[PDB]
Amino acid sequence: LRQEAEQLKNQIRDARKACADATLSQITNNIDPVGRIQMRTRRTLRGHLAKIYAMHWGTDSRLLVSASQDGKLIIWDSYTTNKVHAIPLRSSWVMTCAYAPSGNYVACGGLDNICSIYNLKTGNVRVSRELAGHTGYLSCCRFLDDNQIVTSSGDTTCALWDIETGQQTTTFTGHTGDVMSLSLAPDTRLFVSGACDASAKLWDVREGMCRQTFTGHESDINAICFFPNGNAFATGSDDATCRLFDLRADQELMTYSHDNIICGITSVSFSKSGRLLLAGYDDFNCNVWDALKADRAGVLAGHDNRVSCLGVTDDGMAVATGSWDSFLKIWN
Amino acid sequence: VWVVGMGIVMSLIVLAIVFGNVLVITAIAKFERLQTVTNYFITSLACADLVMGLAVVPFGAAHILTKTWTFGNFWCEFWTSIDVLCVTASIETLCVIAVDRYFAITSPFKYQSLLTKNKARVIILMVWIVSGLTSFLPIQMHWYRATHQEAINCYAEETCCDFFTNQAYAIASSIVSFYVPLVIMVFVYSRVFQEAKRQLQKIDKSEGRFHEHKALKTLGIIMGTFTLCWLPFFIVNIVHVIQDNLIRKEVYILLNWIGYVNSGFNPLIYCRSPDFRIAFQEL
Amino acid sequence: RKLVEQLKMEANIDRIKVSKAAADLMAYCEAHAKEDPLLTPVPASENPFR
Amino acid sequence: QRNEEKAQREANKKIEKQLQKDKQVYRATHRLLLLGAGESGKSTIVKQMRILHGIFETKFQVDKVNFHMFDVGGQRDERRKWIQCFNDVTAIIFVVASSSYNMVIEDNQTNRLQEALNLFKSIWNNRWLRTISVILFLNKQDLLAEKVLAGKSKIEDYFPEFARYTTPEDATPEPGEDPRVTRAKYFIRDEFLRISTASGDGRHYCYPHFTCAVDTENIRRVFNDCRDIIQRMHLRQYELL
Ligand SMILES: Nc1nc2c(ncn2[C@@H]2O[C@H](COP(=O)(O)OP(=O)(O)OP(=O)(O)O)[C@@H](O)[C@H]2O)c(=O)[nH]1
Numbered sequence A: 001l002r003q004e005a006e007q008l009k010n011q012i013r014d015a016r017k018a019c020a021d022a023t024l025s026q027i028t029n030n031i032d033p034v035g036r037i038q039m040r041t042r043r044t045l046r047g048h049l050a051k052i053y054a055m056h057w058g059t060d061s062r063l064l065v066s067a068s069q070d071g072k073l074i075i076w077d078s079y080t081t082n083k084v085h086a087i088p089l090r091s092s093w094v095m096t097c098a099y100a101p102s103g104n105y106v107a108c109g110g111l112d113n114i115c116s117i118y119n120l121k122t123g124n125v126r127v128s129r130e131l132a133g134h135t136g137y138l139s140c141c142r143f144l145d146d147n148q149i150v151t152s153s154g155d156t157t158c159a160l161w162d163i164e165t166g167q168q169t170t171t172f173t174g175h176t177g178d179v180m181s182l183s184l185a186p187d188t189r190l191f192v193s194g195a196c197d198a199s200a201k202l203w204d205v206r207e208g209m210c211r212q213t214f215t216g217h218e219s220d221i222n223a224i225c226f227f228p229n230g231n232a233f234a235t236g237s238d239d240a241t242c243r244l245f246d247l248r249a250d251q252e253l254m255t256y257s258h259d260n261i262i263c264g265i266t267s268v269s270f271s272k273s274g275r276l277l278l279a280g281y282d283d284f285n286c287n288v289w290d291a292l293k294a295d296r297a298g299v300l301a302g303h304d305n306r307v308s309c310l311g312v313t314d315d316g317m318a319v320a321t322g323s324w325d326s327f328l329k330i331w332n
Numbered sequence B: 001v002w003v004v005g006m007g008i009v010m011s012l013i014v015l016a017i018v019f020g021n022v023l024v025i026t027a028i029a030k031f032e033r034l035q036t037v038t039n040y041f042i043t044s045l046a047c048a049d050l051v052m053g054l055a056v057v058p059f060g061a062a063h064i065l066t067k068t069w070t071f072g073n074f075w076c077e078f079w080t081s082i083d084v085l086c087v088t089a090s091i092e093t094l095c096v097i098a099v100d101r102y103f104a105i106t107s108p109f110k111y112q113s114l115l116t117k118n119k120a121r122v123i124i125l126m127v128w129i130v131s132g133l134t135s136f137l138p139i140q141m142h143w144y145r146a147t148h149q150e151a152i153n154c155y156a157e158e159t160c161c162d163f164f165t166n167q168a169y170a171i172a173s174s175i176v177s178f179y180v181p182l183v184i185m186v187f188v189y190s191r192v193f194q195e196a197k198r199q200l201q202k203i204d205k206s207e208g209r210f211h212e213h214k215a216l217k218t219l220g221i222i223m224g225t226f227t228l229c230w231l232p233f234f235i236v237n238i239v240h241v242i243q244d245n246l247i248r249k250e251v252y253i254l255l256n257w258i259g260y261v262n263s264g265f266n267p268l269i270y271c272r273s274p275d276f277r278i279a280f281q282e283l
Numbered sequence C: 001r002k003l004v005e006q007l008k009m010e011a012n013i014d015r016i017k018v019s020k021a022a023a024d025l026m027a028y029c030e031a032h033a034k035e036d037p038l039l040t041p042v043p044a045s046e047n048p049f050r
Numbered sequence D: 001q002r003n004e005e006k007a008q009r010e011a012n013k014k015i016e017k018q019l020q021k022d023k024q025v026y027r028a029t030h031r032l033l034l035l036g037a038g039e040s041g042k043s044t045i046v047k048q049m050r051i052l053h054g055i056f057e058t059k060f061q062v063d064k065v066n067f068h069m070f071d072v073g074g075q076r077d078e079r080r081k082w083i084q085c086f087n088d089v090t091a092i093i094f095v096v097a098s099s100s101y102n103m104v105i106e107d108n109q110t111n112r113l114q115e116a117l118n119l120f121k122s123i124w125n126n127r128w129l130r131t132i133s134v135i136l137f138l139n140k141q142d143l144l145a146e147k148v149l150a151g152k153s154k155i156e157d158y159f160p161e162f163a164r165y166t167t168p169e170d171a172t173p174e175p176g177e178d179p180r181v182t183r184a185k186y187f188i189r190d191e192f193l194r195i196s197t198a199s200g201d202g203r204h205y206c207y208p209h210f211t212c213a214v215d216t217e218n219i220r221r222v223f224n225d226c227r228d229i230i231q232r233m234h235l236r237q238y239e240l241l
């Protein structure tokens, strides 16, 4: 059995090496560089009592929700900078948040191993359901529709829930380390997951089985996101490197790394056209990369502590970054 | 050419005070992380020092150089009131800083609840009101008069400036301004030193095997740099009014100007936090 | 047991050359670069956050 | 119209006023974290403190201050990636069973004491926990005294440094403790401090205690140590000492 497994692994390496016609750099060598990109802060939201570990925009790209370990979940209106809601939390340890596509629900989770759903359009906003089937903490939550939610926990598993009945429709297994992130596809049919075993997978929602595995990194994985096309994704690991993978070619394409940077990465995100790759960092600022050239094109350094979350509006008009100093910022 | 050499020396004493206090004012307001409860007292002290170094010292230097007064019999009293107000308000802030340090160290649990922004603002406003009450009101009421021909001729002349006061007003001003804060500061720092010594003894007893000059130097820099520069002026001020011509005037002005140069020393004594140094290096 | 069965499924899949994927990504980026407010700055008269 | 924004501006005022009230409560409370290896007696200690008045948490009041004690969740032995969240707690409470030197928790692992030292070394030399003090509870004292009193399974069998060790001069013995028991207790205590004092840069210290989890008033000891921790932090900040 052990010999058979090793022989099969060589087939994957042999087939992948044969398809590597050329590197991405030579193909896009003649592309004119974008240049230098500078942005200025437009708003600064205050009112959080402690560090911030979660953030998510809305479909209308006007309202956003933030979660902090003070025991609060505030909803902002970035156009006028006015708080709209403030939901108290039973547990003071919150590590994720989400916002429904229809805008009627908001999710949460944390070290209590229980996911919670609140009904915005009731005031008296209260808990609607408690999805309590897990072991270990949660890392991410995402909404498919008004009745489906996908959660990844810290016990090397992911699950798809059903809000109406509070039961697991299906579960995914195969990771050997804690799962730390996921990202649904634009058509909400596939999704990925970055574990701490320095690997990523590509699950299928309907079938409930893995399809591919990518092992290009060398440390823990803290973030993941999709290209706007849906045929590529980028990963941010504990080391300073970011890598871009391809589903059709099943190989690593291009790496974004700098000698000076020796810190970790907490979040990654793309642009509206999939040309810029903004990634957070542990050295108190954020960087802007180039998808097709790996050339840095600006630094967002208006934060007094590490950046823990990052997001881009659906219309691609602003970038919102949170940090551990309890201050959000909107860049344009 | 005594004036030519002195001019520069007085001049450095004017530029340094204005430039030194400018950094502290800008850094505190510009940066949000530096806006704490304790920093409000430092900001108030810096503002008082800025006002004094901008208004009082240049006019005194001009009077000393030109050897005459030009404004008249109104700006003289205005300048006297301004300098008295700036001197009185500068000292009493140090007592408040000593008191809040004592509260923070002696009572750790109740310190957070005891002091808030409203209480600090009320305390600062009360200190400024008390300082102003002893400077403008007694001078404008003309309660600091003198009874001799020299003072009468001085007030009759429109080109001469001098400071003549009776015993009662000088004693009251000295007691209100300097003597009362001094005993409070001494007691506070003695208690803080005792607490630090006890804590260090406990630490030594806990893990002496495997493992206080810092407190001495930290308290000495704060205490001596203030006392050894400001006590002589007040002792001579009290002495020369109760006695008849026991000391010349030049000594009086020389001992007075040390109080002005103390405003340069204050921002070096305080604002030594690593955040302050980082802000100064950045700006 | 489980690992050997799983790796067989991922061993036999259809793959294309890197050049085609790179060309597709570059073509998509070039085609959609026009409607990117972050790349080309929007006029100040049409900026909601300004 | 403009009337819509008038009501929105009023909604912020009500919300912003509630946050002011929450400022006082959050800023005037202290958070403590319980850590230790398996079967060390963590729940027994918190049970006694509970009567005095997922994740396991307990709130109690002493004098007028507010305290908030919570467990680590009781998760499995693992790499600790959630340890970065607790980087602003007042202190860390460490509970170790000192009466378990001749025991194994796989069956071929080192003795449970050496597993406790290994965990303590990793926690102490942590990048995130570079400014948090540790309170040590050398638990289960009665069993250790019974083991030493009866003649069998000597410490030298598992720790060969017992023969070369002697009672410290500045070690006050307990009135009921025998010389054979006082020596054994202090050998374990100094073993834990050697790791602590070696890599300490002065930011955080360690407080050792000899406690029984069932019949010892631990509440005063925690309160006194917490007061010292805050006092030392202020003294260091003010440059003095
Ligand atoms: N004899 C004695 N036993 C104690 C004492 N304190 C705790 N114990 C033991 O502790 C056991 C109780 O288990 P817990 O205290 O709940 O251990 P735990 O909380 O699960 O600790 P973890 O496994 O690390 O989570 C009892 O059966 C006792 O045998 C003590 O003071 N004396």
Ligand SMILES: CN[C@@H]1CCc2c(ccc(O)c2O)[C@H]1O
Residues within 6 Å of the ligand: B080, B083, B084, B087, B088, B163, B170, B173, B174, B177, B256
């Ligand atoms: C013009 N010089 C004045 C004279 C006396 C005096 C000063 C300051 C504080 C006082 O309480 C005083 O009595 C000095 O600034």
